[model samples]
Target: AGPWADIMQGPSESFVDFANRLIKAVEGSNLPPSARAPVIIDCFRQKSQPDIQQLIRTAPSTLTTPGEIIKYVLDRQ
Candidate 1:
């Protein structure tokens, strides 16, 4: 377990909502950039893993911004 363990301990129907909340909380903390992606990805259920990875892989380069990335994923959900 790590800093994200608390936020990621429960179940949710929407990974988008979970991710969005996480982004906000992380932005307020001192969590390292290197750990951010893994922590964020961990918030999702195993069933969503492949789809989430594909979404990130296929996102437009212009959507590199954090806010845009969240919006892109949320929009796809």
Candidate 2:
């Protein structure tokens, strides 16, 4: 499995660690920005808290990228 599945099934870590791991994974994948956005969003969509999921649904228009999404989630915690 990939980093996404590795992380999803791994220990109960903090969001920062999780996000950072995901960032590293996505960066290493060589996906374009358009593809990367959905990958990150979908990962969180299945795993984040309710409010975070809500943010995932509604905040993308403004956040617009994985870095922005990570910062927004980091800021809220």
Candidate 3:
């Protein structure tokens, strides 16, 4: 199992809320420096299968928003 398999694991009544809170807490600047590095590594290790940096750069202009970009990828899965 991955290190962060359960760190942000969930069964949520409000998926948006849970995801928002988790992303904010871990990805935001408010977290301590000690916590930030692990969260960054764990996030990349656990959730990213293929890095989207290339894809985002090449993707269409219409797919500009985060929701649109994420939906485009998630729909493929």
Candidate 4:
């Protein structure tokens, strides 16, 4: 299992809330900063994944940080 094995978002969860939880979990662990954004993105549930992928594919700020992605997702919430 990965360091973030338990850090999962959900289709029914509030994206804002889930993102905060994930940030706390990562901050509490020894996880590397470089890994944080990908881990957060990876946690996107099936329902939320499509738009995020589209945002990435569409060149929406090239969001490379957890904060940016979280902010982007929050607006769509």
Per lDDT, the best of the predicted structures is: 2
RMSD of 2: 3.4
Q: Where does model 1 exceed 4 Å of error?
A: 5-11, 31-48
Per-residue lDDT over 1-77 for candidate 1, one digit per residue giving the tens place of the 0 to 100 score = 22545564234446566665666676566778787665554444332446665776677666545556667777887
Runs in model 3 lying further than 4 Å from the true structure: 1-50
lDDT of 3 by residue, 1-77 (tens): 23333444244323234334445556545666677655643443344433434443455777644456456655554
Residue pairs in collision within model 2: none
Weakest ten-residue segment in model 1 by summed lDDT: 40-49
**Per-residue lDDT over 36-55 for candidate 4, one digit per residue giving the tens place of the 0 to 100 score:** 66666666432244555565
Q: Which 10 residues in a row give candidate 3 its minimum summed lDDT?
A: 9-18
Candidate 2 per-residue lDDT, tens place, 1-77, comes to 24564445135566667666776787677678678768876776666655666766766477666677777877776
In model 3, residue pairs whose N, Cα or C atoms come closer than 3 Å (at least 3 residues apart or on different chains), thus clashing, are none
Compute each candidate's TM-score over C-alphas: 0.51, 0.59, 0.34, 0.57
**Most accurate candidate by TM-score:** 2
TM-score of 2: 0.59
Q: Rate the local accuracy (lDDT) of all candidates.
A: 0.58, 0.66, 0.47, 0.60
**Residue 36 Cα positional deviation in candidate 3, in Å, after optimal superposition:** 18
Residue 77 shift from truth in candidate 1, angstroms: 3.4
Q: Considering lDDT, which of the candidate structures 2 and 4 is the better prediction for this target?
A: 2
Q: What's model 4's lDDT at 64?
A: 66
